[PDB]
Design an enzyme around this catalytic site. Structure first.
Site: not given
Ligand SMILES: NS(=O)(=O)c1ccccc1
Ligand SMILES: [Zn+2]
Ligand SMILES: NS(=O)(=O)c1ccccc1
Length: 257
Positions: A61, A93, A116, A195-196
């Site tokens: 992903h 991303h 992130h 966000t996933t």
């Molecule tokens: N892409 S995110 O919101 O920072 C995220 C962080 C940890 C696990 C899955 C997603």
């Molecule tokens: Zn992220």
């Protein structure tokens, strides 16, 4: 299972993760004229001098760089946060084109990418207990725009060759995440979610106003990654971003006037 394509992308997620339609989902659009300056915000403190990176992983992903989080070596505190949050990983991303790629948007503007730096609240003892808490995580979000190269990202860009496909990982020690920060720590903050999937609503989001610049060549190398596994048909890892979700009953506070 979930992904970013037409058949398993963000509009499908809600069928397996119903909290996708919940009250505090991320990302959101940051309306800069509606965000209020908040004098109750204490200064933000990013303490990464002792960070220890371990590994980089293509998870099908995004890619993630993971950190040793068995002690207080890289922590975020202050700003809207109470207590100490420990760095566990960062994820990126990005888009198929320089005009899209970020998860958060600013007055509907999409950046070329978004980083992130993900931290968990040490009062909950581990990451997996933290995600079950409304204040369990703090994520620092940083926008990337295409312009000059970012020296402090090149070590990342260079190892991506070795993690082309889903499930590949490589050693990634001695990487200094401070090399990824812009100069200013002016930020917007609001309560939201991963966000996933599983989209858990456990995040205090701290989104930096100042983007970092990366070169066209750097972001082009992100776009050579694959979503698929080794020996599967090649599907370029691009547009691994969720679009902005309803703000609902939330206020975005600004750290700055
Ligand atoms: N892409 S995110 O919101 O920072 C995220 C962080 C940890 C696990 C899955 C997603
Ligand atoms: Zn992220
Ligand atoms: N995206 S999702 O709801 O997890 C999903 C699962 C299987 C097939 C298609 C989509």
């Amino acid at each position: 299972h979930w992904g970013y394509g037409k058949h398993n992308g963000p509009e499908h997620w809600h069928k397996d993760f119903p909290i996708a339609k919940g009250e505090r989902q991320s990302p959101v659009d940051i309306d800069t004229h509606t965000a209020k300056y908040d004098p109750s915000l204490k200064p933000l403190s990013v303490s990464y001098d002792q960070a220890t990176s371990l590994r980089i992983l293509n998870n099908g992903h995004a890619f993630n760089v993971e950190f040793d989080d068995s002690q207080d070596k890289a922590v975020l505190k202050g700003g809207p946060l109470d207590g100490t949050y420990r760095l566990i990983q960062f994820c990126f991303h990005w888009g198929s084109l320089d005009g899209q790629g970020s998860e958060h948007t600013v007055d509907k503007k999409k950046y070329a990418a978004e980083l992130h730096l993900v931290h968990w609240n040490t009062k909950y003892g581990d990451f997996g207990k933290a995600v079950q808490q409304p204040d369990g995580l703090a994520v620092l979000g940083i926008f990337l725009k295409v312009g000059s190269a970012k020296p402090g990202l090149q070590k990342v860009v260079d190892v991506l060759d070795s993690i082309k496909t889903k499930g590949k990982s490589a050693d990634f020690t001695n990487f200094d995440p401070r090399g990824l920060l812009p100069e200013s720590l002016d930020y917007w903050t609001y309560p939201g979610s991963l966000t996933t999937p599983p989209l858990l609503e456990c995040v205090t989001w701290i989104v930096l106003k100042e983007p970092i610049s990366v070169s066209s060549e750097q972001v082009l190398k992100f776009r050579k990654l694959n979503f698929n596994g080794e020996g599967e048909p090649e599907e370029l890892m691009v547009d691994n971003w969720r679009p902005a979700q309803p703000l609902k009953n939330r206020q975005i506070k600004a750290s700055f006037k």
